[PDB]
Symmetry: C3
Subunit: 73 residues, 3 copies
């Protein structure tokens, strides 16, 4: 399934069973943002390592928001 | 309208002010760089692109500022 | 009371009236992780310094999660 990540916006190709760490790797692969500067938000919660996308009920064409941990908080 | 930021300063703000505009005003009064400000209201950490009224922050609401470097 | 902190789990010996800074000092005393690098989660909420354990309804055998600030949310 496709999900969107807005900081501009990128598309990721993901599966519900993917982890947050694994989503961050993909954002790196595409965007060059190191995983350890990424804060991901979905539906107003910051996502945490360990979980999967279905733990947050993230679904097709869900929109995530990336905030840089630098400064941005 | 007046709001309070406790770590306690007063700010003069408009419902339509953005969070980053609030942190700049904090900076101009306190010298704390926006990039080190964590603003909490009603148990939630505020995020840049929102406005005070997206959080129903109102006259004499009290926000809490934590420094990012202090952790939490 | 006993509570557990998972990142490796440690047991701390704490009172409900203890503060989050004090808990974090105890983690430091046992793990050497400095408190300004500790991010404590319980029941889905990041804990904040001005509160006590009872403000979070933390109790005997509650499980907290430590995330390092080196992340990445």
């Amino acid at each position: 399934m496709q999900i969107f990540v807005k900081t501009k916006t990128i598309t990721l190709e993901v599966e519900p069973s993917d982890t947050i760490e694994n989503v961050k790797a993909k954002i790196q692969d595409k965007e060059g943002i190191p995983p350890d500067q990424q804060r991901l938000i979905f539906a107003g919660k910051q996502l945490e390592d360990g979980r999967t996308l279905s733990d947050y009920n993230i679904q097709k064409e869900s929109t995530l928001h990336l905030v840089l941990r630098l400064r941005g908080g």
